[PDB]
Design a protein around this ligand. Structure first.
Ligand SMILES: NC(=O)c1ccc[n+]([C@@H]2O[C@H](COP(=O)([O-])OP(=O)(O)OC[C@H]3O[C@@H](n4cnc5c(N)ncnc54)[C@H](OP(=O)(O)O)[C@@H]3O)[C@@H](O)[C@H]2O)c1
Ligand SMILES: NC(=O)c1ccc[n+]([C@@H]2O[C@H](COP(=O)([O-])OP(=O)(O)OC[C@H]3O[C@@H](n4cnc5c(N)ncnc54)[C@H](OP(=O)(O)O)[C@@H]3O)[C@@H](O)[C@H]2O)c1
Lengths: 245, 245, 241, 245
């Protein structure tokens, strides 16, 4: 089996990605953040639903934390074949209100994380002549959003990274792609009051519904498959038609 | 079982798509150009390999030809759930040398075809609340190419169609997407002398190899699957890194 | 002077482009669908144009028009492909006649008008071709499978041609406008503009045809020689990518 | 007269921008970095060629440095109407060899700078109902580049910032746009030896020549003009056809 690492693999989209990659026959390793005290309960729950994951702590905003995390995974589980950079946060405020701490938290967590997690896995992928790296961006990287100068900068920057790295390692059988989801039915979105969902969110989506986390997971599984080896440097929109270009 | 129509389904990329959709479980119908003299021989060969197709003649440049073809498919096989607009030609000439006849041949065959074949299938898909339309473009629609003012205009036009149609019918469970392949190992390209392939074509492709038509077919199958419902109005690049944006 | 041709140059956006290019120092020629009142009015205002009737969907009409222009004025340095129509209808109801009318008028015209001027530009080592597209080519629009196909196709043409002739000092670019304050848009009642159109535009107003004309004048200038194969959005933020 | 601030205003492209904005009738203030010991000499040189500039020190990677710089400019010169975020560096290394120091240097200098410089000028532009913000990206943000996971991430991130801010403040008469140059005839590009220029650089450029810094300056001046008020959230390519999409 291919070994896959999914950052934020216990969160909304992350769990759906982890579940799908497991179901596709990959051996899945998730990370959990310093704020996450529920790793044991999550592992037990996942096993109750028939699935075995490995879990390791990491701070994706810290270079050394990432290096050490990957070192342990290679030691305990094995060489990393697939990396899904899914960890990310929001700190939404208009530029007028936005302070440096909240600019920084988003750039460091959402963009530095791509450098920090991808650098320690690439050499092995290249050496073996096979790898898949998938970066989870956002429709808001593509179109921008009010309150998201920080988030859009980070998420658009992710795709700049995708393209440069794709060029460096495409010849070695490693693909690097960006996935840009629209609104998904994760906890923080399904919690939105119905009046706002009906008048402000759903009318932006031609499909007329939220995307399922499982649908984004399916796209990630496709990119991670043996038959997706000719797709590289791309940014795939999965947004119900919310944005087209 | 979903019923799929694949235009240009009997050779090159079309054949690969038709095989993949069949193996995905769909009932596949192919179109062939009216003066294609090998339809029965193709069906025999495919049936000898365990695949049961239907095949109908059509001129995709002719509006009435297309309407009537779909009517026969509906009568004989059943309602069309999936359409892959794959038929197309090249008539490469720099603008300096390009004539109106060859401008028209490419616009009519490559762009008018999308209107001609899609119009007769959409109402049924909308009525039933499910459909998939996949338009096959080219990397050259994205980046342009010398000698292809006609082909790039047609192929870029196809994606304009994709986006407008996607908006009209998204809310009714029908997706419309464009797939843009780079260099593929179809008969016309593998016929390239090996030294020309190595010195002139491969250096344009970071992957360092031609794409397999089966790889493109796999992407089309993903888009046609039940789990790709939140992808619409998109243009997915499958080009080994030849073009990024 | 450079000589400029503006198709559809006597009304709407075309008129604003024609005026701006004249005022930039170009000798301007306009085309119209089958002009003295407009020509005389422009003359009174200190602007000398030539006007020719042309069917931009018809290849021979375009070739013959360009012949007259080279005779009467001189070789064409600048071409703005602005002529275009809409025939809006959802795919369900759109007939072949109205698909064709839009592809032929909006897309074939680019081939028909550009082919007869490009060789001269290349021979001389300088030229400017500007294709007027639409935001709706970039984003799609309901009832515009035809219009978006034609307008997106225009930019495929831009990119291929740009590659053919960049080395010889000719640039080819697309301009994609949003909502403009032309006659048929300003005829919209203010209540409908305020509640239906303006909320789509972050700028909160219609674009002026003169603003689009200024961008076209920039592209046609001596200092825009390193811009080619591009699609420039001028839409008040209505679409970004 | 409008007051313009050009970061990196004494460097290759920045000087050209500064000269053109002055010639267009604006009052131009340049910044100079901590490592620049030539401000006095540059001001003298510029005045000997007929132009009066103001110059202030700043470290664009440092939020407080930029806030203080802007305070001084407003005190000494006047409120800022036009901001050109032109300062940027390269630290080119493949991801395999790229260390965190050089990742950070490029993200903080090239992307954090857009937040650090733009935040302190935006309120005033909004208050007066007129402003122009122009962010200098790169063709390599659009296409990616080998050795530039850092630079392309930063440069693509700049445009994410552009789009989100443009949405926040378009209604207030302020525009925000990205300009993405190709190869320019600045000191370090013209220094490249002739064999590499001829075989590696120029063949990537359909125009067959380097871009003049003055050409990019012309575009920036256009964007800063009173007539460009309906252009916002855009990314304008000025690259001699090197990349198209
Ligand atoms: N939901 C949507 O509609 C949507 C749309 C577009 C894009 N996205 C993207 O989807 C991704 C996942 O977010 P989500 O929607 O699933 O929200 P979420 O449940 O809040 O997940 C965010 C994940 O980020 C991880 N994380 C944050 N900071 C971290 C750090 N310093 N170190 C390690 N891990 C860290 C968290 O790990 P722990 O759980 O261990 O704390 C968490 O699993 C994000 O990149 C987001 O930008 C979501
Ligand atoms: N030349 C090209 O081909 C090309 C192509 C695409 C994009 N660009 C972009 O154009 C911009 C200008 O670069 P250039 O080509 O003109 O090269 P350059 O002469 O090296 O200019 C870079 C400028 O950045 C300033 N700078 C760097 N770090 C700084 C800091 N920490 N604080 C304040 N200022 C700082 C420098 O200021 P001092 O001079 O005061 O030290 C300098 O003027 C960059 O953003 C670059 O990415 C250039």
């Amino acid at each position: 089996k291919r070994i896959a690492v999914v950052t934020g693999g216990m969160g909304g989209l992350g769990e759906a990605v982890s579940i799908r990659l497991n179901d596709a026959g990959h051996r899945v390793v998730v990370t959990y953040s310093p704020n996450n005290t529920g790793a044991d309960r999550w592992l037990t729950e996942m096993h109750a639903a028939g699935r075995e994951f490995h879990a390791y702590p990491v701070d994706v905003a810290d270079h050394d934390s990432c290096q050490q995390c990957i070192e342990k995974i290679v030691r305990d589980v094995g060489p990393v074949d697939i990396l899904v950079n899914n960890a990310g946060i929001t700190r939404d405020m208009t530029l007028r209100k936005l302070d440096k701490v909240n600019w920084d938290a988003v750039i460091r967590t959402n963009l530095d994380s791509v450098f920090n997690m991808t650098k320690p896995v690439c050499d092995g992928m290249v050496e073996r002549g096979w790898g898949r790296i998938v970066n989870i961006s956002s429709v808001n990287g593509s179109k921008g959003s009010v309150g998201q100068t920080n988030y859009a900068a980070a998420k658009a920057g992710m795709h700049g990274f995708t393209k440069s790295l794709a060029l460096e390692i495409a010849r070695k059988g490693v693909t690097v792609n960006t996935v840009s989801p629209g609104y998904l039915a994760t906890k923080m979105v399904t919690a939105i009051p119905q009046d706002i969902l009906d008048t402000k969110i759903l009318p932006q989506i031609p499909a007329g519904r939220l995307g399922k986390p499982e649908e984004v997971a399916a796209l990630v599984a496709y990119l991670c498959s043996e038959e997706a080896g000719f797709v590289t440097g791309s940014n795939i929109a999965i947004n119900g038609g919310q944005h087209m270009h």
